Structures are given as structure tokens and as C-alpha cells.
Design a protein around this ligand. Structure first.
Ligand SMILES: CCc1c(NC)nc(N)nc1N1CCCCC1
Length: 154
């Protein structure tokens, strides 16, 4: 089976917001905000909730931009990540226990300190293209298989 997750990228014309994960799963890597969808909330609800929790930020509209399925070898549940983006945010991002936020110019995205799959699908994000992705990981650094396609409906 699969578990739903969310990922929220605040993409502004000349910069993208990322957070350095301070503890837990994926510590020491920059990434968007997000996490597990809870029982009782929509996916979009959970994306807004984790955005608020990890950065203090609220948004008016999130747009569906991607879906990436992850398999980790030896882990039974696939991770079904729904990727959202927004330009217009509400508030100034602040550090949480989980995330230290920072803006990045679009030409200085810290790919070598991000999840490896980001190098593959982030360009599609920056092109405002919608995508389906699949990545199979051995551990947390090695991509063994992957597929990536642009779609019409996420
Ligand atoms: C491990 C799954 C994952 C990943 N795969 C390697 N790549 C990125 N950029 N984000 C991920 N998530 C986003 C949701 C919350 C958990 C971490």
C-alpha cells in the first residue's frame, strides 16, 4: 500500500523558499515543507498545516504541480508525495523546531544538499510543468530506478 505525504514549494519569480531539516527524517538536507497527511484532513489541508507548522506561513492558493512515488527497499509502504507550489504567501517565514527557512536564487538551488531526486524533477517545477515521478531508493543517497514524465492533470 502507500502513505500520503505533502510537499510545498514557495516559488517566487526570482527565488524559491527552502528549509533546512533540523531533526528527524531527512535531517541535514534542504527541502520544501510538508510531511504526513493525517486522518481527517484533505491532502491540501495537510500541506497548509505542515507549511504553517514548519515555517509559520499561510497561503491563499496552493496549486497541484506534482506527484512523486517513492519506494525504499525493504520498507513496505510506498511514499505518495503530492507536490504543491505557490507564489503568494502570507507572512514572513520563521524557524521551527523542524525547519530553518532560507530564500535561494533560482540559479543557486543547493542540489548537492537536497534529496537526490530533486535534481531530476526540480527543473520541471521551475518550468511550471506538471509531472508524475517515481524513484526507488536504496537507503537515502542511491537512486536505483526512476521514471519521470510531464502530465496534463496531476
Ligand atoms: C523521502 C521522500 C522525499 C524525497 N525522496 C527521496 N524527496 C523530497 N524532495 N522530499 C521527500 N519528502 C517530502 C514529504 C515529507 C517527507 C520527505
Amino acid at each position: 500500500a502507500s502513505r500520503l505525504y505533502t510537499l510545498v514549494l514557495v516559488l517566487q519569480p526570482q527565488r524559491v523558499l527552502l528549509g533546512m531539516k533540523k531533526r528527524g527524517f531527512g535531517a541535514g538536507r534542504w527541502n520544501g515543507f510538508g510531511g504526513k497527511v493525517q486522518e481527517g484532513e484533505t491532502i491540501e489541508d495537510g500541506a497548509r498545516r505542515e507549511l504553517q507548522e514548519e515555517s509559520g506561513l499561510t497561503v491563499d492558493a496552493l496549486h497541484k504541480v506534482g506527484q512523486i512515488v517513492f519506494e525504499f527497499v525493504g520498507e513496505p509502504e510506498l511514499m505518495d508525495v503530492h507536490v504543491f507550489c505557490t507564489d503568494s504567501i502570507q507572512g514572513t517565514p520563521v524557524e521551527s523546531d523542524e525547519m530553518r527557512p532560507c530564500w535561494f536564487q533560482l540559479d543557486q538551488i543547493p542540489f548537492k544538499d537536497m534529496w537526490p531526486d530533486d535534481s531530476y524533477w526540480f527543473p520541471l517545477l521551475l518550468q511550471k510543468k506538471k509531472f508524475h515521478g517515481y524513484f526507488k531508493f536504496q537507503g537515502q543517497d542511491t537512486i536505483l530506478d526512476y521514471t519521470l514524465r510531464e502530465v496534463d492533470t496531476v
